[PDB]
Subunit: 396 residues, 4 copies
């Protein structure tokens, strides 16, 4: 009758008041996603063990002080379920390490906990875990006594407090006994200090690795061209990375817009170049139109975007993120369940709203809006339809 | 195909070379005993979780330096299986915490690691865990600058190095999610210093708790009377205790003899008093005679003894230990298997020798003698026949 | 111009917010007392180093939750200066270990931080550090599921919350490179649970060690006899101990009264037996009369008492504690300085009120009362006049 | 009569056998150098505190396994004294972090301990401590599964084990309360893997920061051109860096040769360009000639070199290191003392050999050769003569 995987904590003493108190906040919920993800029972205890030892210490002060970037609310963790064509669902963790020094004189922009977690991650003997590529992006996006101007930017009159993080993490739990670790970099602060357009140094970040190896040039240079033509990738734009070897690496470019017209959604997904040359973009966009209409956003909608550059191709796979905070979680659960019948997905369609009340039995799906925050869409020829749902990740 | 419960370590980094090396030495073997005990899979991960975090650090330096008392060889851990009439077998761990200070100028007699582990065990919220009774026995057997005379005893000419330990622990894994913790006290050192017979201050130790609560007097005074009449309980004698509340507490007195005649085993089991007054003593001794003859010690045999004092009675339950190191592990596996048919034990009889090659697949039961070290015998009216086997507890 | 000894912290990162945050509260003040006590500069850094590594971590959560017993206000540390005839002043620290578990379900009465601090102390190779005697007092005053009745006592209607501590520590920093460690025991909780008079089990605690060694019986039995005749040593009565070897051990019995008449101060100091048999009692009481009159308590006064039993004698040396919180610290500075001229003390008299403004430069001696809380008096033939002043031990 | 600064350790318990055991090896010697450097007594304790907490734990296993690069013998630490014209001598520490994982499958080339120590150095709030520049040089010289080919290089037939380190640290203790941190990079391994000349990728390392800021181009290209014309900078060449901000940064290029003729020493110091344009090179070389002849290397002498690039100039300051291991430390103490009279140094000349027996009172300057290993020479217009002596840095 209770959630199963959380019985490891029975014989564990959390050394600090900070950790025991966070466990009390998220340990229950994480055990429920492992049950939802249908992971092997021995698998769930492995990922629990990792969660207790590396992420609980990394949350830092329980009454938190850091406003994280990766989460809508600000708390430094969010959980996600990756829904895949006719196959077991997966679990995504993206979170930012924090300590009591975060936001202080010593580390006003959370650089220290990032490398603290990254050192433990390397100590963990992880299959095919290589840091050279992510380390390159930090070296480009570090800041020296740019901090002084950043300390100076804190003006109430001139709003200069959108985001303060400088990097973050992501953890994917595949059904095998493996974590793929995914890392993030946030250029707003480095460009804010240099008085240089946010995207201009994103290109150099890619070009500096281009002289190292030059397989991202074509795919990326095509992204810049649209973003220069467009309103432009702005303060909210940022970057992603995988901690795997470079040849297998899949780097991404994120960004945000408040412009919500279907025409603009078509303008970004298609742009110019990628429309003609491949059918997936066209095929995927069609299926993207029906979820846009299934999820009536109630105004008749600011969105995040993503282009996934892979070296083994010259066609970046687009991915968009969709507002569900503000939309009824049942309306979305119902409407999101229909879209699986439209694609012909056998079980996920029927058991999702019953796997949604199961994840939050305390709360009432009738009245909740914030239990579901964002939805991602991606389309590949081989993979079919990618789609992941980001949830409310704290119990309170 | 591999042993299951050890997959927690996949995402764990053992902080010190000392621990990783101990893991490499016993981590495989402990996970095989959990499979042997037929514990629930979530149970096995709980007991592994405990094993990794409290016992691996507690072993100290891998190329060890402390010779422990609790083990035939000296290594500070031994695993044991509790076989019970027609029911699931249980797993016993008895081990002594050690550090690099053990045996040094700072702690020449392993007192500091005992209190170190005992603080952590209390931190872990354990059901019905009360230390006052064990704390009493430590306080009685402590030594202040008796250490100086003890430092002085180290003479090659006058042999004065039989045992150096001062206390130890025991961990019982019942099929529920619970550990019963069992503690030990070693009087040889305190008695060696005081130049006082080893047993006389065992008696004051019981009498000091007798004024606190006086339910052990009858049973215990009956033991002393036999031991005073007898050759006496000697240097090897020592004391046992449970970390539960006093009312439910079951304290034990162990000891050793090299006198091996069946008559002397009968003298010890019966003595005088406990023969007439209760039948279990007579019943249990009868079943004990056939295993004595099944296990031909090949000389036609030094043995350990135990008397279990329970307050809710005035009849201590005897328990003997039998040498199997030196006896063929196959011959013992076979002969121990016949004795279960004589008692009519349904499955334990047939699957024991196949659960013995399973525990040591690397080794050959054909030729091994040291895989099985001791066997304990106990008989109660309610429980029937208690019997446990103590095994070779290191991989090398 | 600044306090000197606090420059070790420059290259130290306090691991927790709790510690750095406690440092900010007490580190400045502790450096000022080392300057006051006129310790060697190499001496001051040794004691600073100890204070940082063992005492700051042991305070636990900074917004404290534990009300300690040893301090007037409740915070778990107090500093004290030992003034001695024509010689360098000394510095006393008495404090109680705390964690976030203190007062929780797991440890509702601070027993765990006591043994945590005690294990580290034994790790520090301290000259002539033997714990067996204090361990004896803890075993006697431990409580097993008396905790349940203690959990049950928390009634607002029947007041049952005077004191919750179970033991505490005290540290004396002599002018040599040595700490003498002093321990405390608090019988209120053990006696409250057993429904047994507080002093009756104090007698057994002394008698249980009397069979071990019987040199405190005479001096102590003389203490019981007066306290039985008197109003009696009450809930507030409690016990003290030194961590040195038993032969050099100097145990004490403290207690409290609200009865403030000079006759009653005389009744306790003299009692019956110790008046006639030694003149020091007579000599010391006289000098004690003038400080009582120098220190007009403004009502024309609850006081603490102490009897120090030494095995090398049969005459316990008394010591009383006097309220100064509520009395103007300047009035106390002036009048305490006059009493040194009455004894003829060369420098302590002249430089005390200037060593008082130096210790609290932020505050105004003109208006402060709580900066000086208690003053102790003792008289020995050999030592002359003992007297120590307890101070306000936090910056805020 | 004893060395003073090591009295902090009295109240410190080194948690691991590895640390206590290293302290016993180097703690005495480090305390004697602080007395030699004539630092303030409160200063020496600050620096001792830092050495105890940050460099002792970083040494890892005491019976070491890692052969470091920065040290002649191989042990991962060396101490050095900076002798300067008519002013207090300074203390240099260069040491490489190590753990039991160093040289393992997990980290076969010591990258993990480098980043561990670098995080702590950032946690300690140090004046003007900026890592972006050092981080840049690591990202360029990292290796991902170049390790596989490096794992493959370990052939006894083709010698491929000159150096295995990838980076190291340096600590400068100035007479104020401040440490300047200096970092090192070892290109041999990265170029060995890429099958690319060791120097060609040093140039890209400088050019990649040149697009970031372009003030090292002129000076550095002047070094490359000489090194290309010359026999060339080889396997032993490596790179140096300061942890200060870029504008004040002083980067260095080191290297080694076995070619020992005075003429070749003249070729390297002068080369072509820097001869004409500035006289310091000419003046400094003159003074260098007499120490070459004072120190008759006994063969009638492989040397290390250094070129210091400062952005605020276009003239790199040379520095050479001279073999003293193999030369009598007294012959060196005497001959090094004459050279101070030649420059007119008031006290350093007279008190040096008496400050040398003081550092090694155990050993006999009469017969020792290995107590003094290398001597560095530098000449500046503003600074005059730089010279530092590298010593035998372990007790055994």
């Amino acid at each position: 009758s209770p959630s199963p995987a959380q019985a490891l904590a029975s014989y564990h003493h959390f050394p600090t008041n900070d950790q025991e108190r966070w466990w009390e906040e998220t340990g229950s919920l994480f055990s429920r996603f492992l049950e939802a993800g249908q992971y092997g029972l021995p698998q769930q205890y492995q990922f629990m063990f990792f969660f207790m030892h590396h992420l609980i210490p990394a949350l830092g002060p329980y009454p938190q002080k850091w406003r994280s970037t990766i989460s809508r609310s600000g708390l430094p963790i969010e959980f996600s379920l990756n829904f895949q064509k006719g196959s077991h669902r997966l679990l995504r963790i993206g979170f930012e390490p924090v300590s009591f020094l975060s936001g202080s004189s010593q580390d006003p922009f959370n650089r220290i906990p990032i490398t603290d977690l990254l050192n433990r991650l390397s100590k963990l003997q992880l299959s095919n875990f290589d840091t050279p590529f992510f380390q390159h992006l930090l070296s480009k996006f570090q800041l020296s006594l740019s901090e002084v101007r950043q300390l100076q930017k804190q003006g109430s009159g001139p709003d200069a407090h959108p985001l303060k993080s400088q990097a973050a993490f992501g953890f994917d739990f595949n059904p095998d006994g493996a974590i793929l670790v995914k890392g993030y970099v946030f250029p707003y602060l480095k460009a804010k200090a240099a008085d240089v357009p946010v995207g201009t140094l994103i290109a150099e970040a890619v070009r500096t690795i281009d002289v190292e190896r030059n397989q991202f040039t074509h795919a990326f240079g095509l992204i810049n061209d649209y973003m220069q033509e467009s309103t432009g990738y702005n303060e909210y734009t940022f970057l992603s990375c995988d901690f795997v070897e470079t040849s297998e690496q899949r780097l991404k470019i994120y960004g945000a817009h408040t412009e919500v017209t279907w025409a603009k959604i078509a303008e970004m997904w298609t742009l110019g170049g990628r429309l003609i040359e491949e059918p997936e973009i066209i095929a995927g966009l069609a299926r993207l139109k029906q979820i846009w209409s299934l999820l009536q956003i109630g105004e008749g909608s600011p969105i995040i975007w993503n282009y996934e550059i892979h070296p083994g191709s010259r066609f970046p796979v687009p991915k968009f993120y969709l507002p569900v905070h503000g939309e009824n979680d049942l309306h979305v659960a119902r409407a999101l369940a229909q879209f699986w019948d439209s694609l012909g997905w056998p079980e996920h369609a029927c058991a999702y709203p019953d796997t949604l009340q199961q994840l939050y039995p305390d709360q009432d799906i009738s009245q909740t809006t914030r239990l579901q925050s964002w939805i991602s869409y991606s389309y590949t020829a081989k993979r079919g339809v990618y789609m992941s749902v980001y949830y409310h990740s704290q119990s309170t």
